[PDB]
Design a protein around this motif. Structure first.
Motif, PDB file in Angstrom:
ATOM      1  N   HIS B  15     -44.934 -32.926 -28.984  1.00 31.40           N
ATOM      2  CA  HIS B  15     -43.960 -34.007 -29.082  1.00 31.40           C
ATOM      3  C   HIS B  15     -44.587 -35.395 -29.096  1.00 31.40           C
ATOM      4  O   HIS B  15     -44.082 -36.310 -28.438  1.00 31.40           O
ATOM      5  CB  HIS B  15     -42.936 -33.907 -27.947  1.00 31.40           C
ATOM      6  N   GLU B  16     -45.682 -35.576 -29.823  1.00 30.76           N
ATOM      7  CA  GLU B  16     -46.286 -36.892 -29.964  1.00 30.76           C
ATOM      8  C   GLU B  16     -46.307 -37.294 -31.432  1.00 30.76           C
ATOM      9  O   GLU B  16     -46.059 -36.479 -32.325  1.00 30.76           O
ATOM     10  CB  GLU B  16     -47.707 -36.889 -29.399  1.00 30.76           C
ATOM     11  N   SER B  25     -47.068 -43.227 -27.869  1.00 31.88           N
ATOM     12  CA  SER B  25     -46.145 -42.607 -26.928  1.00 31.88           C
ATOM     13  C   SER B  25     -44.742 -43.158 -27.150  1.00 31.88           C
ATOM     14  O   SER B  25     -44.570 -44.355 -27.401  1.00 31.88           O
ATOM     15  CB  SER B  25     -46.597 -42.860 -25.491  1.00 31.88           C
ATOM     16  N   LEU B  26     -43.739 -42.287 -27.060  1.00 27.12           N
ATOM     17  CA  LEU B  26     -42.369 -42.666 -27.373  1.00 27.12           C
ATOM     18  C   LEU B  26     -41.388 -41.873 -26.521  1.00 27.12           C
ATOM     19  O   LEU B  26     -41.721 -40.802 -26.004  1.00 27.12           O
ATOM     20  CB  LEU B  26     -42.078 -42.464 -28.866  1.00 27.12           C
ATOM     21  N   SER B  27     -40.179 -42.414 -26.378  1.00 28.90           N
ATOM     22  CA  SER B  27     -39.165 -41.832 -25.513  1.00 28.90           C
ATOM     23  C   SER B  27     -38.639 -40.519 -26.090  1.00 28.90           C
ATOM     24  O   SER B  27     -38.708 -40.286 -27.299  1.00 28.90           O
ATOM     25  CB  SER B  27     -38.017 -42.817 -25.315  1.00 28.90           C
ATOM     26  N   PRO B  28     -38.110 -39.637 -25.232  1.00 28.51           N
ATOM     27  CA  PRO B  28     -37.656 -38.322 -25.728  1.00 28.51           C
ATOM     28  C   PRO B  28     -36.521 -38.394 -26.739  1.00 28.51           C
ATOM     29  O   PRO B  28     -36.666 -37.881 -27.853  1.00 28.51           O
ATOM     30  CB  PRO B  28     -37.233 -37.600 -24.441  1.00 28.51           C
ATOM     31  N   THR B  29     -35.390 -39.009 -26.383  1.00 23.91           N
ATOM     32  CA  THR B  29     -34.262 -39.071 -27.311  1.00 23.91           C
ATOM     33  C   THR B  29     -34.616 -39.884 -28.549  1.00 23.91           C
ATOM     34  O   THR B  29     -34.193 -39.559 -29.667  1.00 23.91           O
ATOM     35  CB  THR B  29     -33.037 -39.660 -26.615  1.00 23.91           C
ATOM     36  N   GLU B  30     -35.384 -40.956 -28.362  1.00 23.97           N
ATOM     37  CA  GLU B  30     -35.911 -41.719 -29.481  1.00 23.97           C
ATOM     38  C   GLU B  30     -36.745 -40.821 -30.388  1.00 23.97           C
ATOM     39  O   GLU B  30     -36.651 -40.908 -31.623  1.00 23.97           O
ATOM     40  CB  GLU B  30     -36.761 -42.863 -28.925  1.00 23.97           C
ATOM     41  N   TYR B  69     -31.607 -48.134 -30.614  1.00 21.64           N
ATOM     42  CA  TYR B  69     -32.647 -47.121 -30.738  1.00 21.64           C
ATOM     43  C   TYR B  69     -33.422 -47.280 -32.041  1.00 21.64           C
ATOM     44  O   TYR B  69     -34.649 -47.129 -32.066  1.00 21.64           O
ATOM     45  CB  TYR B  69     -32.025 -45.733 -30.638  1.00 21.64           C
ATOM     46  N   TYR B  72     -35.856 -49.942 -31.497  1.00 22.02           N
ATOM     47  CA  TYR B  72     -37.062 -49.423 -30.852  1.00 22.02           C
ATOM     48  C   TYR B  72     -37.970 -48.707 -31.845  1.00 22.02           C
ATOM     49  O   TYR B  72     -39.185 -48.928 -31.844  1.00 22.02           O
ATOM     50  CB  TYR B  72     -36.731 -48.504 -29.670  1.00 22.02           C
ATOM     51  N   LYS B  76     -41.796 -49.915 -32.621  1.00 22.59           N
ATOM     52  CA  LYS B  76     -42.872 -49.015 -32.220  1.00 22.59           C
ATOM     53  C   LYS B  76     -43.791 -48.681 -33.391  1.00 22.59           C
ATOM     54  O   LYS B  76     -45.017 -48.663 -33.233  1.00 22.59           O
ATOM     55  CB  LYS B  76     -42.296 -47.736 -31.604  1.00 22.59           C
TER      56      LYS B  76
ATOM     57  N   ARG D  89     -41.899 -35.759 -19.604  1.00 26.97           N
ATOM     58  CA  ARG D  89     -40.621 -36.001 -18.948  1.00 26.97           C
ATOM     59  C   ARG D  89     -39.536 -35.140 -19.580  1.00 26.97           C
ATOM     60  O   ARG D  89     -39.208 -35.302 -20.759  1.00 26.97           O
ATOM     61  CB  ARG D  89     -40.253 -37.480 -19.040  1.00 26.97           C
TER      62      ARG D  89
END
Lengths: 49, 99, 87, 99
Positions: B15-16, B25-30, B69, B72, B76, D89
């Motif tokens: 998940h990267e 690195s990034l947020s899960p839902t994003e 989102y 973001y 990013k 996470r």
């Protein structure tokens, strides 16, 4: 008589055409592709990529 | 099996993301939004069906969440004002290399 | 008329609903109710975990655990084969 | 048939574990966790499948116990703050060499 059926005395070659077009749409684009959802493989044997 | 588009690249396991070869690195839902974008590359994305599939059907919030989102995602990876993640007025967004 | 009912998929949907009811009743009643109100079957709205806790007197982590139990038992091929056919 | 990954060595017969050639004593449940974690190295491991496969299905405890388990694994082999067994996470942990 069955001779006509067996000897192909009265038989005709018949040809049909089937047009189909992929066009632009607000949803995006329609693709002529094998990524066809929820289909088996014995019916996918006779298609090119 | 890693999914690539232009200069963004994704590994389905850990998940990267790589942006032009640089890990980010990034947020899960994003990340799920980005997964939708790559899984439907070249196809326009609208906020509703984005909400329908990516997000839970119990979502009672407003509509600014998806716009934020996308902001973001822009800041990013596509920091440029013109960006590969184009936006359609009333029709949402799309991942596409500009012509 | 695209909006017209197919009159074939309707009966299919009804029989699918019957199969779902049988499968859920085969499962334990607490799990069946949890998933039913989780996906909003009997009512119009699916509900979040805290609603499930308030209606069953449990914490939201316990509801997550029972949901884990639900789809774990639901992967059983006895249900998996009998329902996967319906597509 | 011995399972090796980076600097971790394991023998499936007598269950002894080597960190960089140094043998360490390890608990059975954490031994099963480590065996699973190597056997699926390169794939992220989240908690629900951890309780599904490694632990018994009658497990009624909290979710913090597996966290304490990975804590003892942290203090056992990869004591450093940055460690081979990284975390995600909401998607649990994964063992890969840091890039």
């Amino acid at each position: 008589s069955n001779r006509l059926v067996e000897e192909d005395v009265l038989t005709s070659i018949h040809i049909e055409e089937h047009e189909i077009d992929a066009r632009d749409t607000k949803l995006g684009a329609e693709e002529i592709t094998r990524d066809i959802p929820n289909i088996s493989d014995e019916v996918l044997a006779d298609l090119d990529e | 099996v890693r999914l690539t588009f232009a200069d963004i690249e994704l590994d389905e396991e850990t998940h990267e993301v790589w942006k032009a070869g640089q890990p980010v690195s990034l947020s899960p839902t994003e990340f799920t939004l980005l997964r939708y974008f790559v899984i439907n590359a070249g196809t326009v994305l609208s906020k509703p069906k984005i909400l329908d599939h990516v997000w839970r059907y119990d979502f009672g919030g407003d509509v600014n969440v998806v716009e934020s989102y996308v902001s973001y995602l822009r800041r990013k990876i596509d920091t440029g004002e013109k960006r590969l993640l184009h936006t359609l007025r009333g029709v949402g967004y799309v991942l596409r290399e500009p012509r | 008329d695209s909006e017209a009912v197919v009159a074939v998929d309707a009966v299919s949907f009804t029989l699918l609903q019957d199969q779902l009811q049988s499968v859920l009743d085969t499962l334990s009643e607490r799990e069946a109710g949890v998933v039913r109100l989780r996906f909003g079957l009997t009512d119009g709205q699916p509900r979040t975990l805290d609603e499930i806790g308030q209606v069953y007197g449990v914490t939201r982590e316990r509801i997550r655990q029972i949901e884990s139990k639900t789809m774990s038992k639901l992967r059983h091929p006895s249900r998996s084969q009998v329902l996967r056919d319906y597509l």
